[PDB]
Amino acid sequence: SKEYHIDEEVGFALPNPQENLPDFYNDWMFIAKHLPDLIESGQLRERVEKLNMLSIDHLTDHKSQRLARLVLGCITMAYVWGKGHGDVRKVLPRNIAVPYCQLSKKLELPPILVYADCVLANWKKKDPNKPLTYENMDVLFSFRDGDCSKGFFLVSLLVEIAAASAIKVIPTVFKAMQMQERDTLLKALLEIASCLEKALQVFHQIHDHVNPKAFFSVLRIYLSGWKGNPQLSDGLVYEGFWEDPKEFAGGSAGQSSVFQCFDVLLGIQQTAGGGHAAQFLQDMRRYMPPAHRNFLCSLESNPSVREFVLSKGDAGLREAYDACVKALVSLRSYHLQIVTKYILIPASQGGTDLMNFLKTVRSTTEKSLL
């Protein structure tokens, strides 16, 4: 893969994310570096209205314009949601809303916190010579002390890295179908399933680094957005850029490319059917980095791996393709049980609509067996 922005060690994650902005943007990072306290003390919101509108002409490289997208997104959620107790701002100050919107249209992303910001670009290594383990990693920004933002953002990022071992096989899968090497394709399909069989064990780390009550009551509030939300029934006013209020969806892992790139690979038509679940995942491709959004396009253009395995009558190929699909069904089933412990049960002490979305997705993945 070339120019699709896919590292081979971390995958869709941003490799070596930049931690510090230039000196010119010291007013921004100081606000973002100290979000837990500026929110509790009620100082944040005024300190955004007391900002001087800066210019993005001094963010040059890729890793700057991404971290600035991470900084102005963490700030925007804190301004809009405040302490996370219902008090909602409907207007975003123009001295920060303009450079955010200026930077978004440069990266073809929407002006809101997305999966690619606080998961894929929000990380670093403690010791830069030790492996990618939860113990050697940390996040760049949090929202509130005790929000379990580290365990949430990082366990998701570690799954994104276990999937990288399977994405470097994708070119060898398509080559083996054009040059027609059945034995090479079977090796590839079995290797992909093995990588997805190992990623399921990374999902277990969520139980030692995230709290149910602190995720439901606290963290889920700051990752929310303004789209069909009664708290901003019309949307958010981005002062300076649009005279109209705009609606953008909140933080969702439907913007994640890992589990989508395999549905596209294995021919699972998750994005067809005109349902609420099929609609949601296609819309969330606009919240994806344009290179990752284009890599998924190139996968949907290549010939189907399903319509190839099904056309040869090869009991060895069918059982390997089912190994890939059964690996996805297990991941999503474990993921479903996590939402039960972390959303449904806490809400019993809004969610049913969400757990139905995953069951629709898990079932479609499971109907694609052979």
Ligand code: HEM
């Ligand atoms: C406490 C932990 C977790 C909770 C409560 C949770 C919750 C949810 C919910 C409610 C949805 C559907 C609504 C939405 O998209 O916002 C979802 C979707 C999704 N989440 Fe999670 N999740 C957790 C952990 C993870 C992790 C660690 C990953 C790692 C990649 C992940 C990946 C995904 C994906 C790919 C989807 C899209 C559905 C699919 O493609 O199957 N989730 N999650």
Ligand SMILES: Brc1ccc(-c2csc3nccn23)cc1
């Ligand atoms: Br913004 C943002 C959007 C999504 C996530 C995320 C990682 S895993 C997971 N399940 C549901 C959401 N989600 C984290 C930050």
